Paper text:
In particular, the β-d-galacto configured cyclopentylamine bearing a 4-bromobenzyl moiety at the nitrogen (15), has been found to excel in terms of inhibitory activity and recently prepared compounds 16 and 17 are powerful inhibitors of human lysosomal β-galactosidase and potent pharmacological chaperones for the R201C mutant of this enzyme. For all the C-1-substituents in 1, 16, 17 and 31, (an NH-octyl group in 1 and 16, and NH-C6-NH-dansyl groups in 17 and 31), and the C-5a-substituted NH-C6-NH-dansyl groups in 14 and 22, there are very few interactions between the protein and substituted derivative moieties. The most salient variation in hydrogen bonding occurs at the 2-OH group, which is present in 1, 16 and 17. The group is tethered by interactions with ND2 Asn204 (all 2.8–3.0 Å) and to both OE atoms of Glu349 (2.6–2.7 Å) Hydrogen bonding patterns for 16 and 17 are very similar, despite the different groups bound at C-1, which are probably flexible and show few polar interactions with the protein, and not surprisingly, the Ki values determined for these inhibitors with recombinant human lysosomal β-Gal are very similar. Another key ligand-protein interaction is displayed for compounds 1, 16, 17 and 31, which feature hydrogen bonding interactions from their amine groups at ring position 1 to Glu205 (2.6–2.8 Å) and with a water which is also hydrogen bonded to ND2 Asn135, and in the case of 1, to the C-4 hydroxyl group.
Numbering used by the authors: 36 to 436, 439 to 575
């Protein structure tokens, strides 16, 4: 009965439709070795503590086809049953031809048979442990197994507990830019396919001729993109679920060279190749392990496009990362999924939290508690209207802030500069919001930031003068956007409340102290409807 999940894109906005309405993945992803029935008891408690609505978890080629033609979906059976018992949804991660550039999750009969399923050859003739996207046997084998997984979901997942599939994991190659095998050179030292030369507005020729100094990297990205599109089409012909690829990001400011980063993945410089080569892949999702605000903000900008829904398919699970939920959703993002949210005795520190404990989880639970009570309403406003979101824009001071060695004039100057940086403006049409971080709930002492950095805010427009507002360790203040020609302005009314059956239910009116000094949020959840008014005095 249930309509298929679908990614919609209209008027440069996006929605992930689940059960016929926009949905936000408030996600969690397991560690990489939790894809087994015995591991799930170490997954669910963290997911319930986090309040996540969707679990991302691997389904490995080596586990569903351990002997060629001998399929085993015993894990998928247990996973679907246990997800449904907990009323959560699933994103399955197809670990196959590539998992972090390598074939470690391909069956032994694949990854130990280089002649049938061939590896990238470097220019010097050394071989890398990265399967070539020009291996036709490898493409056929991956596609065949992925089709069998999709047939399992077609037959056994009629209500779409699984809402989306990631095809491969962090594709590309470390250690070279492309395959330089004889097989690969015969394709490289030849015409660029008609279809790519058209989609990019370029002149006919060989890879070297039309792309020059980008030929090696664009060639790898196109061939991988084509490989992933073919797997994707084969699977969607069985069940047309949304499907996506995740990116082992290059640093957007100082990337270095392809092969230092994972060459051929959907890095920012080849998104045009990926979009032209792989029209069947719904979106290209960034995997975010940069901790600093400016780099993360740049990633969110680069991956949010009229042709690309923003899904933060992975993000580090350390404390600093939780606040990026707010700009992700403010960009119209469809979801956010911290990595390593299970108690299987692993942490990917230095990428994530040094320690995995209930405090680690709580940093994400606290932000999820702001969005879960309005998730369907937010998702619709994000698609059909105007939303905004911001995070605290200074990172935690390093055990260095050099700050103490500064002079006592350099210091008041430091404090004014920090207060300015911790003050964000948002243009909401007739009204602006100013968001500030780390100050009392009364009076106007300048902001000093939270320790550690943690704050954020979400705003959705309900009407010309009315906004839905929730924020965290932050003050939000409204003002007129344009000079008012004689008129004055006030807050007309602030209500705290909730949605029941899609209707607003008031709990209380914020007024007095609670609205004299902006709208002040701590760690606790409050959903507000704010109505502003200009009024005549003359
Ligand atoms: C700031 C520098 C970050 C560079 C390292 C990024 C690689 C990130 N790889 C991610 C994969 O998609 C996951 O399966 C898992 O392996 C994860 C890392 O725990
Ligand atoms: Na959206
Ligand atoms: Na305006
Ligand atoms: Na304005
Ligand atoms: Na409330």
């Amino acid at each position: 009965a249930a309509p298929l999940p679908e990614l919609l894109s209209n008027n440069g906005k996006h929605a992930l439709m689940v059960d016929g309405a926009p949905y936000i993945i408030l996600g969690s992803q397991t560690n990489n070795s939790s894809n087994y029935p015995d591991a799930l008891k170490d997954v669910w408690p963290s997911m319930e503590k986090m309040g996540a609505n969707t679990l991302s978890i691997p389904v490995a080629w080596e586990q569903i086809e351990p002997v060629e033609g001998q399929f085993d979906f015993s894990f998928v059976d247990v996973l679907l049953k246990e997800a449904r018992q907990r009323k959560v949804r699933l994103v399955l991660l197809w670990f196959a031809t590539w998992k972090n550039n390598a074939p470690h999750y391909a069956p032994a009969w694949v990854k130990l048979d280089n002649a049938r399923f061939p590896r990238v050859v470097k220019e010097d003739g050394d071989t890398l442990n990265s399967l070539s996207p020009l291996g036709q046997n490898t493409l056929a084998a991956d596609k065949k197994a992925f089709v069998e997984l999709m047939k399992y979901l077609a037959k056994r997942d009629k209500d779409h507990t699984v809402i989306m599939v990631q095809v491969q994991n962090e594709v590309g190659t470390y250690g070279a830019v492309r395959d330089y095998s004889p097989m690969a050179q015969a394709v490289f030292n030849a015409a660029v396919p008609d279809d790519l030369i058209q989609k990019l507005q370029l002149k006919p020729g060989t890879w070297s001729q039309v792309f020059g100094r980008d030929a090696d990297e664009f060639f790898h990205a196109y061939q991988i993109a084509r490989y992933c599109d073919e797997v994707t089409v084969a699977g969607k012909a069985i069940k047309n679920l949304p499907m996506y690829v995740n990116v082992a990001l290059r640093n957007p400011f100082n990337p270095g060279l392809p092969g230092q980063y994972s060459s051929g993945g959907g890095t920012d410089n080849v998104l045009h190749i990926w979009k032209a080569a792989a029209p069947n892949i719904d979106l290209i999702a960034p995997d975010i392990y940069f901790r600093d605000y400016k780099t993360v903000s740049k990633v969110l900008e680069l991956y949010t496009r009229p042709d690309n829904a923003l899904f933060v398919a992975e993000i580090g699970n350390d404390q600093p990362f939780a606040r990026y939920l707010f700009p992700t959703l403010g960009k119209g993002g469809i979801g956010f999924s911290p990595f390593g949210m299970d108690d299987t005795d692993y942490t990917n520190y230095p990428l994530g939290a040094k320690v995995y404990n209930d405090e680690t989880i709580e940093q994400f639970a606290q932000v999820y508690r702001l969005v879960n009570p309005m998730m369907r309403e937010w998702a619709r406003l994000s698609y059909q209207g105007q939303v905004w979101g911001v995070a605290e824009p200074l990172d935690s001071t390093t055990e260095t802030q050099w700050n103490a060695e500064a002079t006592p004039e350099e210091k008041e100057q430091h404090k004014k500069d920090r207060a300015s940086a911790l003050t964000q403006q948002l243009d909401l049409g007739l009204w602006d919001a100013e968001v500030t971080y780390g100050r009392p709930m009364f009076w106007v002492t300048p902001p000093e930031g939270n320790t550690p950095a943690a704050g954020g805010a979400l705003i959705a427009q309900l009407d010309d003068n009315e906004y839905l507002v929730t924020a965290y360790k932050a003050r939000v203040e409204f003002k007129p956007s344009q000079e008012l020609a004689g008129k004055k302005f006030m807050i007309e009314r602030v209500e705290e409340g909730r949605f029941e059956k899609g209707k607003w239910v008031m709990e209380r009116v914020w007024n007095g102290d609670q609205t004299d000094w902006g709208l002040n949020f701590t760690d606790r959840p409050h959903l507000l409807r704010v109505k502003m008014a200009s009024y005549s005095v003359q």
